[PDB]
Amino acid sequence: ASRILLNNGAKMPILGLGTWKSPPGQVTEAVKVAIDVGYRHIDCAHVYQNENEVGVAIQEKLREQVVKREELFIVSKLWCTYHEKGLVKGACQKTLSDLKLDYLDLYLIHWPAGFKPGKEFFPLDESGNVVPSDTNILDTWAAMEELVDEGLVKAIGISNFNHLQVEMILNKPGLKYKPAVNQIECHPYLTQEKLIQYCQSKGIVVTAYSPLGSPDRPWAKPEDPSLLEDPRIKAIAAKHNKTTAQVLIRFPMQRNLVVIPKSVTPERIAENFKVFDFELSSQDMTTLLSYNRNWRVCALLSCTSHKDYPFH
Ligand SMILES: NC(=O)c1ccc[n+]([C@@H]2O[C@H](COP(=O)([O-])OP(=O)(O)OC[C@H]3O[C@@H](n4cnc5c(N)ncnc54)[C@H](OP(=O)(O)O)[C@@H]3O)[C@@H](O)[C@H]2O)c1
Ligand SMILES: O=C(O)COc1cc(F)ccc1C(=S)NCc1ccc(Br)cc1F
Ligand SMILES: [Br-]
């Protein structure tokens, strides 16, 4: 089953293409190839600085009639410096303009924390701490709801929200639209059982980011754990005549998660999509879950004192 039903009534492809770190001179081809080989979901963000180039690909494939717009599921995210009532619509509109779209399928609050507006994505004080905004996650959520009512987005959701932050949203006085998705880091070294069960219990679909462990993250260190090189995961892959990446992508799929592996390599884009013709056993699944080490690749010291930093 290639799509999962969201609490807004729309269906979301369980496999998408990630675009963080995809170079602007490679991402247009990456997205073109992805659509040609079957991808229907692209995960984007304004902070990734490549939405224009992603958009060139989407638009060309729509113009070529490779795909219809209704068949695509395009996701983007509101950056931290736009949490303000008066900035949310324009931030969404910039993303739409760049992506060459008239609506998004899903728009996420990228991180729960708001930062001081301005040119800089991470405004810092003189001692290196991020400069917060005073706007909370409830007022930012109201601004997201307006986007649904204005036709700019079909669904809204959240990303990197912890259990208490999700609960805050769900308990919002006058809540109009529930979050459809919570997009969080998830892989065998950070299995997220507690947060996933909470979200799923509330009808919120979870998307797993960095499912391969983000080996290209800029802050990687040579001796960090490596999922793709873990011999235990290689052994499960060999047993199934699949690659390690294919196992790492199928794993979240069988947990009823959406998953968004990134690649700019055409052969790997195609490889990564060939995950609908095999099944991990229950024993395989439990074995992969057993590798949890609470190892989080996406975290940021400069933001750890923000009142809404999620990983405290
Ligand atoms: N919401 C958030 O805060 C948040 C945070 C992090 C990530 N995300 C989203 O999640 C996406 C995926 O996470 P990620 O980019 O951190 O990392 P990832 O998807 O876990 O790993 C990407 C890395 O794996 C490599 N790779 C891909 N397929 C491979 C294969 N078959 N064999 C070997 N290596 C392979 C890629 O290399 P090449 O590209 O060189 O092929 C790239 O270096 C992001 O791009 C972004 O869209 C969201
Ligand atoms: O964020 C992504 O999608 C992928 O990561 C990034 C992608 C970018 F284009 C720029 C920075 C990040 C960083 S550094 N993200 C971590 C991060 C940001 C904000 C807060 Br609150 C906490 C935190 F941990
Ligand atoms: Br945050």
The answer to whether 82 is a known catalytic residue is no
Is 252 annotated among the ligand-binding residues?
A: yes
Please give the distance of CA 206 from its chain centroid, rounded to a whole number. Answer: 9
Q: Is 62 exposed, middle or buried (0-12, 13-18, 19+ CB in 10 A)?
A: middle
Atom of ligand 1 nearest to the CA of 20: 45
22 is in an annotated binding site: no
The coordinates were experimentally obtained by X-ray
Which atom of ligand 2 is nearest to 113's Cα?
Answer: 21
Ion ligand 3 nearby residues (CB, 5 A): 111, 113, 309
**Has domain 1-312 been given CATH number 3.10.20.30?**
no
Does ligand 1 lie within 6 Å of residue 51's CB atom?
A: no
Quote the crossing angle between the two packed helices 266-273 and 24-37, to the nearest 10°: 40
Give me the count of residues in the chain. 312
How far apart, in Å, are the Cα atoms of 128 and each of 113, 150, 305? 16, 38, 11
Distance separating alpha carbons of residues 295 and 190, to the nearest angstrom: 5
The active-site residue out of 48, 107, 198, 309 is 48
Resolution (A): 1.1
Rounded CA separation 62/67 (Å): 6
Q: Is the separation of the CB atoms in 104 and 75 below 8 Å?
A: yes
Task: For ligand 2, pick from 22, 43, 46, 47 the residue to mutate: most ligand atoms within 8 Å of CB.
Answer: 47
Characterize the bridge pairing of strands 11-13 and 106-109: unpaired
Q: In whole angstroms, what is the distance from residue 260 CA to residue 207 CA?
A: 7
DSSP-derived secondary structure for the chain: --EEE-TTS-EEESB-BB-TT--HHHHHHHHHHHHHHT--EEE--GGGT-HHHHHHHHHHHHHTTSS-GGG-EEEEEE-GGG-SHHHHHHHHHHHHHHHT-S-BSEEEESSS--B--SS-SS-B-TTS-B-B-S--HHHHHHHHHHHHHTTSBS-EEEES--HHHHHHHHT-TT--S--SEEEEE-BTTB--HHHHHHHHHTTPEEEEESTT--TT-TT--TTS--STT-HHHHHHHHHTT--HHHHHHHHHHTTT-EE--B---HHHHHHHH--SS----HHHHHHHHTT-----SS--GGGTTSTT-S--
- Flag whether 220 is marked binding: yes
- Find the radius of gyration of the CA atoms of the chain: 19
